[PDB]
Design a binder for this molecule. Structure first.
Ligand SMILES: *[C@@H]1O[C@H](CO)[C@@H](O[C@@H]2O[C@H](CO)[C@@H](O)[C@H](O)[C@H]2NC(C)=O)[C@H](O)[C@H]1NC(C)=O
Ligand SMILES: *[C@@H]1O[C@H](CO)[C@@H](O)[C@H](O)[C@H]1NC(C)=O
Ligand SMILES: *[C@@H]1O[C@H](CO)[C@@H](O)[C@H](O)[C@H]1NC(C)=O
Lengths: 50, 50
């Protein structure tokens, strides 16, 4: 007999929601993986990607 | 040395008696409604019931 502060199992999520920026551009993977010329190691190339 | 006059004084005595009846749910504090973290937590056993 008495009162009990029971653990909280009553509610469980059901579905998922996915939200991302609305960009349709394909990334330039080719320009770095498929490149005519790679930089030498001492002068290694650093390409910003965006 | 004998008293001939007196006085009636009033003093204040303050005593704490109780505290805030805190309670804690482990699952929210530790994991935050994440089932996988709770599942890993179950390996620890009866810490939280204790
Ligand atoms: C005994 O002491 C008390 C104070 O502790 C005296 O009471 C005061 O007496 C004076 C003079 O009579 C009054 O002006 C005050 O108003 C009294 N106090 C209060 C709170 O009223 C008392 O009179 C003294 N008694 C004797 C016989 O000396
Ligand atoms: C992206 O943004 C525009 C304007 O804010 C909005 O109308 C559109 O629904 C969003 N999503 C896509 C996939 O374009
Ligand atoms: C890289 O080149 C090969 C052959 O030249 C080609 O098959 C492949 O599609 C290229 N990569 C991309 C991302 O287009």
């Amino acid at each position: 007999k008495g009162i009990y502060q029971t653990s909280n199992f009553r509610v469980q999520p059901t579905e998922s929601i996915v939200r991302f920026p609305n960009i349709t551009n394909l990334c330039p993977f080719g320009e770095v993986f498929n490149a005519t010329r790679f930089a030498s190691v001492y002068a290694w190339n650093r390409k910003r990607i965006s | 040395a004998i008293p001939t006059n007196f006085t009636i004084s009033v003093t204040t005595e303050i005593l704490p008696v109780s505290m805030t009846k805190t309670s804690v749910d482990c699952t929210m504090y530790i994991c935050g409604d994440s089932t996988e973290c709770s599942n890993l937590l179950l390996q620890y056993g009866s810490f939280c019931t204790q």
